[PDB]
Amino acid sequence: GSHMAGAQDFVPHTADLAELAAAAGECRGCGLYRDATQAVFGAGGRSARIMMIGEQPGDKEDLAGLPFVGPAGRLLDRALEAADIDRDALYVTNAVKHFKFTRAAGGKRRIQKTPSRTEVVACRPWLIAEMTSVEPDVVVLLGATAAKALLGNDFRVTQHRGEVLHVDDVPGDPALVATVHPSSLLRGPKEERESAFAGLVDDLRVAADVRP
Ligand SMILES: O=c1cc[nH]c(=O)[nH]1
Numbered sequence: 001g002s003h004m005a006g007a008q009d010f011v012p013h014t015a016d017l018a019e020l021a022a023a024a025g026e027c028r029g030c031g032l033y034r035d036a037t038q039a040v041f042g043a044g045g046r047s048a049r050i051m052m053i054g055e056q057p058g059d060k061e062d063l064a065g066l067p068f069v070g071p072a073g074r075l076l077d078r079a080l081e082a083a084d085i086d087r088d089a090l091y092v093t094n095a096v097k098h099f100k101f102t103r104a105a106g107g108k109r110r111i112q113k114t115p116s117r118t119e120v121v122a123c124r125p126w127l128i129a130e131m132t133s134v135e136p137d138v139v140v141l142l143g144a145t146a147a148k149a150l151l152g153n154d155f156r157v158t159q160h161r162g163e164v165l166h167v168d169d170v171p172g173d174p175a176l177v178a179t180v181h182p183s184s185l186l187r188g189p190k191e192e193r194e195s196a197f198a199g200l201v202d203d204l205r206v207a208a209d210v211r212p
């Protein structure tokens with residue numbers, strides 16, 4: 001009803017990641033396909049047991065067609081290295097698959113703008129498809145958007161950071177760990193950003209030890 005179908009019309013009944021990624025290029029589940037160059041689907045293979053979910057592609061992601069290749073990806077890799085996790089053993093994706101940005105004169109263009117909850121819920125069927133395909137043991141939710149995508153619109157990362165949680169409406173019942181988004185660490189107060197980074201590394205280590 002006045003709740004949207006969003007991407008559900010566009011998701012094929014398949015577990016194959018190539019078929020899903022190509023189908024996502026055709027998605028018109030929300031408005032974000034219009035400004036964006038292409039859909040940015042996940043990176044990695046179905047053999048991964050840990051899935052990590054960011055917010056949305058940024059500028060270089062939208063051009064490259066792959067997640068976490070810009071500055072946020074550098075910070076993500078710093079954290080993964082500190083947590084002794086191999087990025088190529090992960091399945092990395094985003095809550096929203098099309099880059100949302102403004103082109104408005106005169107400000108910085110091609111910088112991320114906040115996805116609407118409408119858009120996140122519209123795009124969530126792709127996440128469900130990816131979780132059905134990869135069958136992760138653990139899903140790390142990087143930041144508020146991704147966390148709310150699976151844990152609900154009233155979810156606060158600051159109240160549950162690093163806890164190992166479960167929800168009732170996701171296929172296969174992976175453990176969920178909500179944590180800091182690496183992009184949040186690019187700028188901000190020094191002490192809090194470094195405490196947040198250490199907490200991210202802790203949460204990543206926790207996620208790597210969990211088998212529900
Ligand atoms: O892939 C990406 C890049 C930047 N920020 C995100 O949330 N995901």
Ligand code: SF4
Nearest residue numbers: 027029030097098123
């Ligand atoms: S952001 Fe997601 S729901 Fe919206 S058009 Fe792109 S793939 Fe479809």
